[PDB]
């Protein structure tokens, strides 16, 4: 995935005109005017606005801490033009995220008219989507929390078409997320936050658990209610706490659904190219599931197939139910938190599938789970074993593994301090290189080649793994033309010469092949070759009963002399012999 375009800056544009209700507002009892978990009435018209803005910033920093922050509170016209221009100047080629709230603004028109003014509501100021597109002509992501949000998307597309037609005398670069369709309004529900769509996109948990408590017709866990849900301990990233485990499961499920629903052409673009885009779409699927129950249909561009019907959501509810049954006692008594069996069962199902896999079958649905399991230190050995067994099938099995992104993770596992992982990483890399030798020198740019040299050096490792290691080294030496120096720095020649006497036919063949491949166009190991009289040992393999070994010996010996002769000098003695 060479296309690594990233988001650089985020613009937060708020129109939360606290204390002012547009004339088309229906009020008030169930209004539930809770925004970013803040009730503005308890603080007043100025403190509340700044506090809400601060929380919105915090909610976004949780997903991309490195983003450049930019914020406007009730900007009018020049304020927005200047903001967009400054952000474009900050990064002209990268993506910009534009988040428009609109809660304090009358329902949008076909032009996007907004209630921004110098503290006098009679100055509605009509705006133009076309002009906004002009200011931000870079690749960009738009988020709309408007009631008739779909209307904006439709106008946006029509204006983009208009511009293209004018240019015949941005459409393909923009991504849009709209809260709901142009013909429906956001729900007025006394128990939900007003900014429901934002909450779903920015705080996937919280509302997910609140909804669980409210939506369930008959609760199956007596004693668990919101008073405890809001007291669940732990950091979102602390993998060993309740919330940590829940976030891990949530991520695994939403990735599995995306993998098993979308075409690969969209999957790679939306869930791999950019960390923020992938996070937003991952949460979008939840927003769709929740908002469906209130007669709202979130709208996005590009359009995705519906997913609320997928079976995996049942697994989520089960996992949530199990967690929550322990919450009371942990709070009341302090009992240790027990981990769920979720990943163990998913691995078991994968293992069952492996019983008899063929090309003429649907691929396993759980590869995105194995990818997640490999990130921890609990079930890593089992996931690596099962992955190996999967990869042992014909080349098609490897291609699927490549398409999900095993590669960049096994490159990291290659340099761990563990030793017990040796035969697994060797097997996996032997199969990957056997199928895909085009890897752009990743094993020789980093220190991975050193690992395999040490693996070869280990005198107690079984011959099967020594053979695979020799194969790997031969491949990277002939394949990359940068490992040519590294194989000499580690004295690979000395190791191969010592190993020429190994009784196993394949170690004899691959060691001879490694030596032949080393002595190609090296000046340093032209001299090292002649210096150590390496040929003196290789010709003894010409006596080997097995013709495959004799062929390997003839190859290595002929190559040795053919290249050593470039000097001639005293080595002409060798050349003739």
């Amino acid at each position: 995935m060479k296309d690594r375009m990233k988001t650089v800056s985020v613009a937060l544009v708020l129109c939360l005109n606290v204390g002012v209700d547009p004339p088309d507002v229906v009020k008030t009892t169930p209004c539930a005017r809770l925004e970013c978990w803040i009730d503005p009435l308890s603080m007043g018209p100025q403190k509340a606005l700044e506090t809400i803005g601060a929380n919105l910033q915090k909610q976004y920093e949780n997903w991309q801490p490195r983003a450049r922050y930019k914020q406007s509170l009730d900007p009018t016209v020049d304020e927005v033009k200047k903001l967009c221009t400054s952000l474009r100047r900050n990064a002209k080629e990268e993506r910009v995220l534009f988040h428009y709230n609109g809660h304090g603004v009358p329902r949008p028109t076909v032009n996007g008219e907004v209630w921004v003014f110098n503290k006098n509501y009679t100055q509605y100021i009509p705006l133009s989507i076309y002009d906004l597109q002009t200011w931000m002509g870079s690749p960009s992501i738009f988020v709309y929390d408007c009631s008739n949000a779909g209307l904006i998307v439709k106008s946006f597309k029509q204006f983009a078409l208009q511009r293209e037609q004018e240019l015949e005398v941005s459409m393909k670069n923009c991504i849009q997320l709209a809260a709901c369709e142009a013909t429906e309004l956001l729900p007025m529900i006394p128990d939900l936050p007003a900014d429901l769509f934002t909450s779903c996109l920015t705080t996937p948990i919280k509302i997910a658990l609140r909804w669980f408590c409210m939506q369930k017709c008959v609760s199956l866990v007596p004693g668990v209610t919101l008073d405890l849900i809001e007291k669940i301990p732990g950091r979102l990233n602390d993998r060993r706490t309740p919330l940590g485990e829940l976030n891990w499961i949530f991520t695994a499920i939403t990735d599995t659904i995306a993998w098993n629903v979308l075409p690969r052409d969209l999957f790679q673009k939306l869930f791999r190219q950019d960390l923020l885009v992938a996070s937003l779409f991952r949460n979008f699927l939840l927003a769709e599931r929740i908002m469906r129950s209130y007669n709202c249909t979130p709208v996005s561009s590009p359009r995705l197939p519906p997913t609320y019907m997928h079976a995996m959501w049942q697994a989520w509810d089960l996992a949530v139910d199990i967690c929550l049954s322990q919450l009371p006692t942990i709070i009341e008594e302090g009992t240790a938190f027990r981990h769920s069996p979720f990943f163990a069962e998913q691995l078991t199902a994968f293992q069952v599938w492996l019983t008899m896999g063929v090309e003429n079958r649907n691929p396993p649905e759980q590869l995105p789970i194995v990818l997640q399991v490999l990130l921890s230190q609990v079930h890593r050995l089992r996931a690596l074993d099962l992955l190996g067994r999967f990869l042992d099938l014909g080349p098609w099995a490897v291609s699927l593994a490549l398409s999900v992104g095993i590669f960049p993770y096994v490159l990291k596992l290659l340099q761990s301090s563990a030793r017990e992982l040796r035969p697994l990483l060797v097997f996996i890399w032997a199969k990957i290189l056997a199928v895909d030798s085009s890897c752009q020198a990743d094993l020789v740019k980093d220190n991975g080649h050193k690992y395999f040299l040490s693996v070869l050096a280990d005198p107690y490792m079984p011959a099967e793994h020594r053979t695979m290691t020799a194969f790997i080294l031969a491949v990277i030496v002939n394949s990359y033309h940068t490992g040519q120096e590294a194989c000499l720095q580690g004295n690979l020649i000395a190791i191969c010469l010592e190993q020429l006497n190994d009784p196993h036919p394949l170690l004899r063949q691959w060691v001879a092949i490694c030596l032949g491949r080393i002595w190609q166009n090296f000046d340093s190991a032209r001299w090292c070759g002649v210096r150590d009289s390496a040929h003196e040992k290789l010709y003894s393999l010409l006596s080997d009963p097995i013709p495959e070994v004799r062929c390997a010996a003839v190859f290595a010996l002929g190559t040795f002399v053919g290249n050593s002769a470039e000097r001639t000098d005293h080595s002409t003695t060798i050349d003739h012999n």
Binding site: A278, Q372, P408
Partner: peptide, 8 residues
């Protein structure tokens, strides 16, 4: 680098 953290 990686989209997800690894406990190396």
């Amino acid at each position: 680098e990686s989209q997800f953290e690894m406990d190396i």
